[PDB]
């Protein structure tokens, strides 16, 4: 959930859940960039222009 407390970690007895490298907001921004690029420019999105 990335908002967990450390009391859950001591409940786990040493097991921890590391947050992912990419935030869900950053994933949404990447998806938005992909959609805008493909709808506007077509396959020239991939070549770079």
Partner 1 sequence: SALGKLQDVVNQNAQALNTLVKQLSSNFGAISSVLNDILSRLDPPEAEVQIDRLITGRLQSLQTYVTQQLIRAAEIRASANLAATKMSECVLGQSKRVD
Partner 2 sequence: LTGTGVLTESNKKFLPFQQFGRDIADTTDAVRDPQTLEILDITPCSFGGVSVITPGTNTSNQVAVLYQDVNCTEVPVAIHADQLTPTWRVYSTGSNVFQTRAGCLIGAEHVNNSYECDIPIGAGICASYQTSQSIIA
Partner 3 sequence: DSTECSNLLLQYGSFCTQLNRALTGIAVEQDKNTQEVFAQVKQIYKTPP
> What residues line the site for partner 1 (CB under 8 A)?
34, 38, 43, 45-47
CB-based contact 49:41 (threshold 8 Å): yes
Spell out, one character per residue from 2 to 31, where the chain touches partner 2: x when CB under 8 A holds, - when not: xxxxx--xxx-x--x-xxxxxx-xx-----
- Quick one: what does residue 23 bind among partner 3, partner 2, partner 1, none, with the CB cut-off 5 to 8 Å set by partner type? partner 2
- Which residue is associated with the tokens 């950053």? 26
Q: Which of 3, 47 has the CB closer to partner 3?
A: 47
Q: How far, in Å, CA of 37 to CA of 40, rounded?
A: 5
Alpha carbon distance 29, 18 (integer Å): 22
């Amino acid at each position: 959930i990335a908002a967990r407390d450390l009391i859950c970690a001591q409940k786990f007895n040493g097991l921890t859940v590391l947050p992912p490298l990419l935030t869900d907001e950053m994933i949404a921004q990447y998806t938005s960039a992909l959609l805008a690029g493909t709808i506007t420019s077509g396959w020239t999105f991939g070549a770079g222009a």
